[PDB]
Design a binder for these strands. Structure first.
Ligand SMILES: Nc1ncnc2c1ncn2[C@@H]1O[C@H](COP(=O)(O)OP(=O)(O)OP(=O)(O)O)[C@@H](O)[C@H]1O
Ligand SMILES: [Mg+2]
Length: 344
DNA sequence: AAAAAAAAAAAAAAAAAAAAAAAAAAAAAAAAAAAAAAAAAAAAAAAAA
């Protein structure tokens, strides 16, 4: 509602935002402002920032095609203790219109809608669930793997059609659910074992995986130096004693209100080439396969990156960053045709 | 060993008839009393050497 109303920013504030947009490291600087007390998950924070900006909302009514999913979906899969839940909790406590779910505490009707009695008018009233409450926001699903398949089947329609067609006795209707999904899962056997492929080790249906347009593998490199650095960060966090949030908030609201990035010609060609190369790279045995849904993924991420720069026009740097982020998540460089992830 | 199933199986809510319970509820007629008035019998005081 605030982004809707036109006098949210003074002119000098708009100039301040625009001057911020012109810095070379605005993407880095905005991503780093997220979760300031989480130590160097820079790419994850970039992806979450892109989720906050979102892709471009397009009207596909005349194409007779069905609504396009402009929201960005992220899976954080990694071995335990790697700060996934802290990121989901940070996002949950940051956005308006969010919901947080963990494990088996949610049922399918509890995620979509059900009928209760109004204990003040004794009328049966339909009441929404967690995925409709976070309609124009973000749903953070924690312990995504530890979630029974009856209630994850619900996520297919939400994550593709952005709608939720309940066909029950009382009323049948399509509830709109334009939520962005931020999920955290453990691998099969709740620890990456490096003798299994990515697919064998994530253990999620290829359809469900294709619905996520970033999969960050939060693997733990058995690394002395990184352990030392994170140890110092965590201990310093016990004796504690940037980019302001009041400008990050305004920057994001401005980007939502004014910027609607459109694909340019070089972006279009780069997207085509990126999709073809992505299919060749992921067509291997145990790697995460690419589908046309991943080309739509790339379009979304590129539009989000162009929204970060207040670009209002997607060109080749945005597509390059989308492809780079899609590679870095999933550790495409550290896999191989004999699928399996190396220690860097 | 876990992963879908595929039932119990419990609750809340609904119905859904029963079968019991609960809630509404002045005016019309009569009689008796106490008072009158009236026909009859009865009991008074004026008449006279
Ligand atoms: N950059 C970091 N990497 C790993 N751990 C961190 C980092 N920063 C902080 N931590 C600490 O590590 C702990 C990780 O707990 P958290 O619940 O986030 O783990 P998780 O990966 O989300 O859960 P799971 O064990 O189910 O995968 C947190 O308490 C946090 O304080
Ligand atoms: Mg956790």
């Amino acid at each position: 509602d605030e982004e809707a109303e036109q006098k949210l920013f003074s002119e000098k504030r708009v100039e301040l935002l625009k001057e911020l947009s012109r810095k070379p490291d605005i993407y880095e600087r905005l991503a780093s402002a997220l979760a300031p007390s989480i130590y160097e998950h820079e790419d994850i924070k970039k992806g979450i920032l892109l989720q906050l900006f979102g892709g471009t909302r397009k009207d596909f009514s005349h194409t007779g095609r069905g609504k396009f999913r402009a929201e960005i979906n992220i899976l954080l899969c990694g071995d335990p203790g790697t700060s996934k839940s802290q990121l989901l909790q940070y996002v949950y406590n940051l956005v308006p219109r969010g919901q947080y779910t963990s494990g088996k505490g949610s049922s399918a009707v509890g995620l979509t809608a059900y009928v209760m009695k109004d204990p003040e008018t004794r009328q049966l009233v339909l009441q929404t669930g967690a995925l409709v409450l976070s309609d124009n926001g973000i749903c953070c699903i924690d312990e995504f793997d530890k979630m029974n398949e009856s209630t994850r089947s619900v996520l297919h329609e939400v994550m593709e059609q952005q709608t939720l067609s309940i066909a029950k006795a009382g009323i049948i209707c399509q509830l709109n659910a334009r939520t962005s999904v931020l999920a955290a899962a453990n691998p099969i056997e709740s620890q990456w074992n490096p003798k299994k492929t990515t697919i064998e080790n994530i253990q999620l249906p290829h359809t469900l995986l294709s619905r996520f347009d970033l999969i960050f593998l939060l693997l733990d490199p058995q690394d002395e130096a990184y352990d030392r650095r994170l140890a110092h960060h965590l201990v310093a966090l016990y004796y504690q004693s940037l980019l302001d949030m009041a400008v990050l908030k305004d920057y994001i609201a401005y980007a939502h209100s004014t910027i609607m990035p459109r694909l340019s010609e070089e972006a279009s060609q780069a997207l085509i080439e990126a999709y073809v190369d992505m299919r060749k790279i992921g067509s291997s045995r145990g790697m995460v396969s690419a589908y046309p849904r991943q080309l739509e993924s790339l379009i979304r991420l590129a539009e989000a990156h162009a929204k970060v720069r207040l670009s209002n026009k997607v060109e080749a740097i945005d597509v390059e960053e989308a492809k780079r982020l899609h590679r870095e998540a999933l550790k495409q460089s550290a896999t191989d045709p004999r699928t399996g992830i190396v220690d860097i």
